Amino acid sequence: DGFKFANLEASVVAFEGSINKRKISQWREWIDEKLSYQPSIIIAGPQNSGKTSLLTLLTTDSVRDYDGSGVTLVDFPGHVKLRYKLSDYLKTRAKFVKGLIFMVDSTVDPKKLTTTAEFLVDILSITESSCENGIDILIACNKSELFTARPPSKIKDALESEIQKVIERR
Amino acid sequence: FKFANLEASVVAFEGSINKRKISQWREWIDEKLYQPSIIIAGPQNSGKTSLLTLLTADYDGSGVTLVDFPGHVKLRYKLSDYLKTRAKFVKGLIFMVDSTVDPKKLTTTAEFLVDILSITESSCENGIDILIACNKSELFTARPPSKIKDALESEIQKVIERR
Protein backbone atom coordinates (compact mmCIF):
# COMPACT_ATOMS: atom_id res chain seq x y z
CA ASP A 1 0.00 0.00 0.00
CA GLY A 2 0.74 3.75 -0.02
CA PHE A 3 3.33 6.26 1.27
CA LYS A 4 2.97 6.77 5.06
CA PHE A 5 4.90 9.29 7.18
CA ALA A 6 4.88 6.48 9.72
CA ASN A 7 7.20 4.36 7.57
CA LEU A 8 9.89 7.01 6.94
CA GLU A 9 13.21 6.47 8.60
CA ALA A 10 12.91 9.59 10.72
CA SER A 11 10.18 10.69 13.13
CA VAL A 12 7.51 13.03 11.85
CA VAL A 13 5.16 15.06 14.04
CA ALA A 14 2.61 17.77 13.12
CA PHE A 15 1.74 20.72 15.45
CA GLU A 16 -0.41 23.77 14.98
CA GLY A 17 0.81 27.35 15.58
CA SER A 18 0.14 30.99 14.72
CA ILE A 19 2.73 33.49 13.56
CA ASN A 20 0.24 36.41 13.56
CA LYS A 21 -0.75 35.79 17.19
CA ARG A 22 2.68 34.53 18.35
CA LYS A 23 1.28 31.26 19.54
CA ILE A 24 4.22 28.91 18.82
CA SER A 25 4.77 27.05 22.13
CA GLN A 26 4.60 23.53 20.68
CA TRP A 27 7.01 24.49 17.85
CA ARG A 28 9.46 25.90 20.41
CA GLU A 29 9.17 22.84 22.60
CA TRP A 30 10.11 20.70 19.58
CA ILE A 31 12.98 23.07 18.58
CA ASP A 32 14.33 23.20 22.19
CA GLU A 33 14.14 19.47 22.40
CA LYS A 34 16.19 19.03 19.19
CA LEU A 35 18.62 21.89 19.85
CA SER A 36 33.21 21.22 14.77
CA TYR A 37 29.63 22.55 14.95
CA GLN A 38 26.73 23.62 17.19
CA PRO A 39 23.30 21.90 16.73
CA SER A 40 21.06 23.36 14.01
CA ILE A 41 17.60 22.83 12.63
CA ILE A 42 16.47 23.66 9.03
CA ILE A 43 13.44 25.79 8.24
CA ALA A 44 11.91 24.75 4.90
CA GLY A 45 9.10 26.41 2.96
CA PRO A 46 8.19 28.48 -0.12
CA GLN A 47 7.91 32.28 -0.31
CA ASN A 48 5.30 33.63 2.11
CA SER A 49 5.31 30.36 4.26
CA GLY A 50 6.24 32.38 7.39
CA LYS A 51 9.94 31.60 7.75
CA THR A 52 11.30 35.07 8.21
CA SER A 53 8.56 35.80 10.76
CA LEU A 54 9.38 32.52 12.54
CA LEU A 55 13.05 33.47 12.72
CA THR A 56 12.27 36.94 14.21
CA LEU A 57 10.11 35.33 16.93
CA LEU A 58 12.73 32.71 17.76
CA THR A 59 15.52 35.36 18.03
CA THR A 60 13.55 38.32 19.50
CA ASP A 61 10.64 36.95 21.50
CA SER A 62 12.43 34.43 23.74
CA VAL A 63 13.71 35.28 27.22
CA ARG A 64 17.25 34.04 26.33
CA ASP A 65 36.00 26.62 10.40
CA TYR A 66 35.24 27.21 6.65
CA ASP A 67 34.61 24.07 4.64
CA GLY A 68 34.50 24.33 0.83
CA SER A 69 33.01 20.94 0.10
CA GLY A 70 30.63 21.21 -2.89
CA VAL A 71 30.96 25.05 -3.06
CA THR A 72 31.15 26.57 -6.55
CA LEU A 73 30.40 30.22 -5.48
CA VAL A 74 31.35 31.95 -2.19
CA ASP A 75 31.61 35.67 -1.21
CA PHE A 76 34.30 37.69 0.53
CA PRO A 77 34.68 38.88 3.23
CA GLY A 78 31.44 37.14 4.33
CA HIS A 79 32.18 33.58 3.16
CA VAL A 80 28.54 33.28 2.11
CA LYS A 81 28.06 30.06 0.07
CA LEU A 82 25.77 30.45 -2.87
CA ARG A 83 23.88 27.47 -4.47
CA TYR A 84 24.79 25.60 -1.31
CA LYS A 85 23.16 22.14 -1.71
CA LEU A 86 21.04 20.67 1.08
CA SER A 87 22.92 17.40 0.55
CA ASP A 88 26.30 19.05 1.24
CA TYR A 89 25.12 21.00 4.26
CA LEU A 90 23.88 17.70 5.65
CA LYS A 91 27.06 15.76 4.76
CA THR A 92 29.36 18.37 6.29
CA ARG A 93 27.41 18.91 9.58
CA ALA A 94 26.32 15.29 9.82
CA LYS A 95 25.16 14.68 13.37
CA PHE A 96 24.94 18.33 14.34
CA VAL A 97 21.75 18.73 12.19
CA LYS A 98 18.97 17.83 14.51
CA GLY A 99 15.74 18.33 12.63
CA LEU A 100 13.84 19.95 9.81
CA ILE A 101 10.63 22.08 9.87
CA PHE A 102 8.22 22.30 6.93
CA MET A 103 6.11 25.46 7.19
CA VAL A 104 2.64 24.66 5.83
CA ASP A 105 -0.75 26.32 5.99
CA SER A 106 -3.54 24.77 8.05
CA THR A 107 -6.10 26.22 5.54
CA VAL A 108 -4.59 24.64 2.34
CA ASP A 109 -6.92 24.22 -0.71
CA PRO A 110 -6.48 21.22 -3.05
CA LYS A 111 -4.14 23.17 -5.34
CA LYS A 112 -1.75 24.54 -2.73
CA LEU A 113 -1.61 20.91 -1.35
CA THR A 114 -0.06 19.52 -4.56
CA THR A 115 2.81 22.01 -4.82
CA THR A 116 3.54 21.57 -1.06
CA ALA A 117 3.58 17.72 -1.37
CA GLU A 118 6.11 18.06 -4.20
CA PHE A 119 8.37 20.29 -2.05
CA LEU A 120 8.14 17.64 0.80
CA VAL A 121 9.07 14.84 -1.61
CA ASP A 122 12.09 16.75 -2.87
CA ILE A 123 13.43 17.67 0.59
CA LEU A 124 12.52 14.32 2.30
CA SER A 125 14.24 12.37 -0.51
CA ILE A 126 17.44 14.18 0.44
CA THR A 127 17.10 14.06 4.28
CA GLU A 128 16.11 10.44 4.32
CA SER A 129 19.12 9.32 2.20
CA SER A 130 21.59 11.52 4.07
CA CYS A 131 22.06 9.07 6.93
CA GLU A 132 20.66 6.11 8.87
CA ASN A 133 17.47 7.24 10.53
CA GLY A 134 17.06 10.37 8.28
CA ILE A 135 16.49 13.79 9.93
CA ASP A 136 13.43 14.33 12.20
CA ILE A 137 10.59 16.38 10.78
CA LEU A 138 8.11 18.91 12.21
CA ILE A 139 5.14 19.81 10.00
CA ALA A 140 4.52 23.31 11.40
CA CYS A 141 0.82 23.91 10.71
CA ASN A 142 0.58 27.70 10.63
CA LYS A 143 -2.45 29.98 10.67
CA SER A 144 -4.04 27.94 13.43
CA GLU A 145 -6.19 30.92 14.39
CA LEU A 146 -8.13 30.97 11.04
CA PHE A 147 -11.74 29.98 10.88
CA THR A 148 -10.93 27.77 7.86
CA ALA A 149 -8.02 25.93 9.65
CA ARG A 150 -8.00 22.14 10.01
CA PRO A 151 -6.40 20.10 12.83
CA PRO A 152 -2.70 19.20 12.35
CA SER A 153 -3.63 15.48 12.06
CA LYS A 154 -5.88 16.17 9.12
CA ILE A 155 -3.24 18.30 7.42
CA LYS A 156 -0.71 15.51 7.94
CA ASP A 157 -3.25 13.00 6.53
CA ALA A 158 -3.96 15.17 3.48
CA LEU A 159 -0.23 15.66 2.77
CA GLU A 160 0.40 11.86 3.02
CA SER A 161 -2.31 11.14 0.47
CA GLU A 162 -1.17 13.79 -1.98
CA ILE A 163 2.44 12.65 -1.63
CA GLN A 164 1.34 9.16 -2.75
CA LYS A 165 -0.24 10.67 -5.89
CA VAL A 166 2.95 12.65 -6.61
CA ILE A 167 4.99 9.43 -6.43
CA GLU A 168 2.36 7.71 -8.68
CA ARG A 169 2.51 10.57 -11.27
CA ARG A 170 6.21 9.60 -11.75
CA PHE B 1 31.69 36.95 -28.46
CA LYS B 2 34.32 39.22 -27.02
CA PHE B 3 35.02 39.99 -23.34
CA ALA B 4 35.46 43.61 -24.60
CA ASN B 5 31.80 43.74 -25.75
CA LEU B 6 30.41 42.82 -22.25
CA GLU B 7 28.92 45.58 -20.18
CA ALA B 8 31.37 44.92 -17.25
CA SER B 9 35.16 45.17 -17.33
CA VAL B 10 37.07 41.90 -17.69
CA VAL B 11 40.76 41.65 -16.69
CA ALA B 12 43.03 38.54 -16.45
CA PHE B 13 46.07 38.44 -14.04
CA GLU B 14 48.60 35.73 -13.11
CA GLY B 15 49.08 34.49 -9.54
CA SER B 16 50.31 31.41 -7.60
CA ILE B 17 48.32 30.12 -4.66
CA ASN B 18 51.07 27.48 -4.11
CA LYS B 19 53.79 30.23 -3.84
CA ARG B 20 51.59 32.83 -2.19
CA LYS B 21 52.30 35.38 -4.90
CA ILE B 22 48.84 36.88 -5.57
CA SER B 23 49.61 40.64 -5.46
CA GLN B 24 47.78 41.48 -8.64
CA TRP B 25 44.64 39.69 -7.48
CA ARG B 26 44.87 41.51 -4.13
CA GLU B 27 45.24 44.85 -5.83
CA TRP B 28 42.14 44.26 -7.92
CA ILE B 29 40.27 43.03 -4.88
CA ASP B 30 41.34 45.99 -2.69
CA GLU B 31 40.33 48.39 -5.56
CA LYS B 32 36.82 46.89 -6.16
CA LEU B 33 36.00 46.63 -2.49
CA TYR B 34 25.59 45.97 3.49
CA GLN B 35 29.43 45.90 3.39
CA PRO B 36 31.15 45.65 -0.01
CA SER B 37 31.66 42.14 -1.21
CA ILE B 38 33.09 40.20 -4.08
CA ILE B 39 32.28 36.76 -5.32
CA ILE B 40 34.75 33.91 -5.87
CA ALA B 41 33.66 31.41 -8.55
CA GLY B 42 35.10 28.06 -9.56
CA PRO B 43 34.73 24.23 -9.51
CA GLN B 44 36.07 21.94 -6.80
CA ASN B 45 39.84 22.10 -6.71
CA SER B 46 40.14 25.60 -8.32
CA GLY B 47 41.74 27.04 -5.20
CA LYS B 48 38.90 29.03 -3.67
CA THR B 49 39.48 27.79 -0.10
CA SER B 50 43.21 28.50 -0.27
CA LEU B 51 42.45 31.91 -1.75
CA LEU B 52 40.07 32.74 1.12
CA THR B 53 42.78 31.66 3.62
CA LEU B 54 45.21 34.13 2.01
CA LEU B 55 42.66 37.01 2.05
CA THR B 56 41.32 36.37 5.57
CA ALA B 57 22.99 43.38 8.17
CA ASP B 58 19.30 42.40 8.91
CA TYR B 59 18.24 39.03 7.61
CA ASP B 60 16.50 39.17 4.20
CA GLY B 61 14.49 36.12 3.02
CA SER B 62 13.86 36.96 -0.70
CA GLY B 63 14.13 33.78 -2.77
CA VAL B 64 14.88 31.75 0.33
CA THR B 65 13.32 28.30 0.52
CA LEU B 66 15.69 26.69 3.04
CA VAL B 67 17.37 28.48 6.03
CA ASP B 68 19.01 27.08 9.19
CA PHE B 69 18.72 28.17 12.83
CA PRO B 70 20.41 29.54 14.86
CA GLY B 71 22.83 30.35 12.03
CA HIS B 72 20.46 31.80 9.45
CA VAL B 73 22.52 30.03 6.75
CA LYS B 74 20.71 30.06 3.42
CA LEU B 75 20.66 26.91 1.37
CA ARG B 76 20.20 26.76 -2.43
CA TYR B 77 20.72 30.57 -2.40
CA LYS B 78 20.58 31.73 -6.03
CA LEU B 79 23.23 34.00 -7.49
CA SER B 80 20.42 36.11 -8.98
CA ASP B 81 18.92 36.63 -5.55
CA TYR B 82 22.23 37.40 -3.89
CA LEU B 83 22.84 40.00 -6.61
CA LYS B 84 19.31 41.51 -6.52
CA THR B 85 19.35 41.82 -2.71
CA ARG B 86 22.89 43.36 -2.31
CA ALA B 87 22.80 45.40 -5.56
CA LYS B 88 25.59 48.03 -5.73
CA PHE B 89 27.46 46.59 -2.76
CA VAL B 90 28.64 43.67 -4.96
CA LYS B 91 31.77 44.98 -6.57
CA GLY B 92 33.31 42.13 -8.58
CA LEU B 93 33.47 38.42 -9.32
CA ILE B 94 36.62 36.28 -9.65
CA PHE B 95 36.74 33.24 -11.90
CA MET B 96 39.41 30.86 -10.62
CA VAL B 97 41.04 29.20 -13.70
CA ASP B 98 44.19 27.14 -14.36
CA SER B 99 46.98 28.66 -16.47
CA THR B 100 47.86 25.12 -17.65
CA VAL B 101 44.80 24.08 -19.54
CA ASP B 102 44.14 21.04 -21.70
CA PRO B 103 41.54 21.63 -24.47
CA LYS B 104 39.39 19.15 -22.45
CA LYS B 105 39.22 21.43 -19.40
CA LEU B 106 38.44 24.52 -21.57
CA THR B 107 34.86 23.62 -22.54
CA THR B 108 33.69 22.92 -19.01
CA THR B 109 35.33 26.18 -17.85
CA ALA B 110 33.77 28.13 -20.74
CA GLU B 111 30.33 26.70 -19.87
CA PHE B 112 30.71 27.78 -16.27
CA LEU B 113 31.75 31.35 -17.29
CA VAL B 114 28.72 31.70 -19.62
CA ASP B 115 26.36 30.48 -16.98
CA ILE B 116 27.72 32.95 -14.42
CA LEU B 117 28.21 35.89 -16.88
CA SER B 118 24.74 35.67 -18.28
CA ILE B 119 23.46 36.15 -14.73
CA THR B 120 25.93 38.98 -13.73
CA GLU B 121 25.34 40.92 -16.92
CA SER B 122 21.53 40.66 -16.60
CA SER B 123 21.67 41.85 -12.95
CA CYS B 124 22.23 45.53 -13.76
CA GLU B 125 23.39 48.10 -16.20
CA ASN B 126 27.13 47.59 -16.73
CA GLY B 127 26.94 44.09 -14.99
CA ILE B 128 29.60 42.96 -12.39
CA ASP B 129 33.39 43.49 -13.08
CA ILE B 130 35.33 40.29 -13.71
CA LEU B 131 38.80 39.12 -12.69
CA ILE B 132 40.04 36.02 -14.48
CA ALA B 133 42.47 34.75 -11.77
CA CYS B 134 45.02 32.64 -13.74
CA ASN B 135 46.42 30.32 -11.08
CA LYS B 136 49.49 27.99 -11.14
CA SER B 137 51.33 30.54 -13.22
CA GLU B 138 54.67 29.27 -11.88
CA LEU B 139 54.32 25.91 -13.73
CA PHE B 140 56.31 25.03 -16.79
CA THR B 141 53.04 24.29 -18.55
CA ALA B 142 51.62 27.81 -17.66
CA ARG B 143 50.38 30.14 -20.45
CA PRO B 144 50.31 33.91 -19.93
CA PRO B 145 47.02 35.54 -18.80
CA SER B 146 46.46 37.17 -22.20
CA LYS B 147 46.49 33.74 -23.89
CA ILE B 148 44.23 32.16 -21.30
CA LYS B 149 41.79 35.00 -21.74
CA ASP B 150 41.82 34.66 -25.60
CA ALA B 151 41.44 30.86 -25.30
CA LEU B 152 38.39 31.22 -23.09
CA GLU B 153 36.80 33.82 -25.46
CA SER B 154 37.04 31.54 -28.45
CA GLU B 155 35.66 28.60 -26.49
CA ILE B 156 32.74 30.68 -25.18
CA GLN B 157 31.76 31.45 -28.80
CA LYS B 158 31.69 27.69 -29.60
CA VAL B 159 29.58 26.98 -26.53
CA ILE B 160 27.19 29.81 -27.54
CA GLU B 161 27.08 28.47 -31.08
CA ARG B 162 25.47 25.26 -29.67
CA ARG B 163 22.11 27.01 -30.22
Side-chain angles (χ1 to χ4, degrees), chain A residues 31 35 39-47 51-52 55 58-59 66 68-77 79-86 89 93 100 119 122-123 126, chain B residues 29 33 36-44 48-49 52 55-56 59-61 63-70 72-79 82 86 93 112 115-116 119:
Chain A
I31 285 172
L35 257 29
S40 59
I41 57 147
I42 300 147
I43 305 188
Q47 174 181 68
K51 308 189 292 297
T52 295
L55 289 161
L58 291 178
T59 312
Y66 180 81
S69 183
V71 173
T72 65
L73 293 170
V74 55
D75 90 354
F76 181 91
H79 295 51
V80 172
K81 300 173 204 178
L82 312 186
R83 312 174 167 176
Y84 195 25
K85 288 133 109 309
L86 178 59
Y89 176 93
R93 286 152 170 285
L100 187 145
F119 181 68
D122 170 14
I123 296 319
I126 297 151
Chain B
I29 287 166
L33 285 179
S37 64
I38 55 130
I39 301 165
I40 311 173
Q44 192 81 56
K48 300 193 291 307
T49 301
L52 298 156
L55 272 14
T56 312
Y59 175 83
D60 190 327
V64 179
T65 68
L66 296 170
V67 54
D68 96 347
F69 172 92
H72 288 54
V73 171
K74 300 174 193 168
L75 313 179
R76 298 174 177 180
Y77 191 34
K78 293 163 80 173
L79 173 58
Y82 176 93
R86 286 161 181 269
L93 180 150
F112 189 58
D115 159 17
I116 299 305
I119 292 140

Side-chain angles (χ1 to χ4, degrees), chain A residues 2-3 5-64 66-90 92-110 112-169:
Chain A
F3 172 90
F5 280 118
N7 303 149
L8 283 183
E9 300 308 308
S11 289
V12 180
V13 292
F15 301 136
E16 68 181 358
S18 174
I19 296 286
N20 279 186
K21 300 187 84 23
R22 310 168 209 75
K23 296 168 99 194
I24 62 154
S25 270
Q26 287 194 302
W27 300 345
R28 292 180 165 287
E29 190 187 343
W30 188 92
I31 285 172
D32 287 348
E33 168 138 298
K34 294 300 200 323
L35 257 29
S36 346
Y37 293 108
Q38 285 341 97
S40 59
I41 57 147
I42 300 147
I43 305 188
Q47 174 181 68
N48 304 151
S49 64
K51 308 189 292 297
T52 295
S53 278
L54 178 55
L55 289 161
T56 293
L57 256 16
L58 291 178
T59 312
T60 266
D61 198 41
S62 340
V63 188
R64 324 209 128 238
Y66 180 81
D67 185 320
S69 183
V71 173
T72 65
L73 293 170
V74 55
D75 90 354
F76 181 91
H79 295 51
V80 172
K81 300 173 204 178
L82 312 186
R83 312 174 167 176
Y84 195 25
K85 288 133 109 309
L86 178 59
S87 64
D88 295 315
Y89 176 93
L90 291 180
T92 55
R93 286 152 170 285
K95 279 170 177 208
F96 298 99
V97 188
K98 269 17 168 166
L100 187 145
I101 308 180
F102 286 108
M103 301 297 292
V104 313
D105 190 324
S106 308
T107 76
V108 294
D109 81 307
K112 199 186 184 152
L113 227 211
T114 291
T115 181
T116 309
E118 290 157 28
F119 181 68
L120 270 68
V121 160
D122 170 14
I123 296 319
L124 290 171
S125 79
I126 297 151
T127 58
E128 286 277 290
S129 45
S130 77
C131 71
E132 184 175 17
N133 309 144
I135 286 121
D136 295 334
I137 305 309
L138 170 58
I139 308 177
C141 298
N142 195 22
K143 291 169 44 171
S144 58
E145 81 283 355
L146 256 285
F147 72 96
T148 48
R150 303 243 56 218
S153 54
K154 293 298 214 131
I155 302 306
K156 191 170 128 132
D157 292 353
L159 254 4
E160 198 177 57
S161 291
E162 181 71 18
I163 291 177
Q164 175 57 32
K165 308 197 180 53
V166 164
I167 290 158
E168 284 331 280
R169 293 183 204 127

Side-chain angles (χ1 to χ4, degrees), chain B residues 135-146 148-158:
Chain B
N135 183 29
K136 290 180 151 16
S137 62
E138 76 280 345
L139 301 196
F140 73 91
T141 48
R143 277 322 274 142
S146 56
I148 296 301
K149 186 177 154 172
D150 297 347
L152 286 170
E153 203 169 52
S154 132
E155 187 62 21
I156 289 163
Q157 179 54 217
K158 302 192 176 142

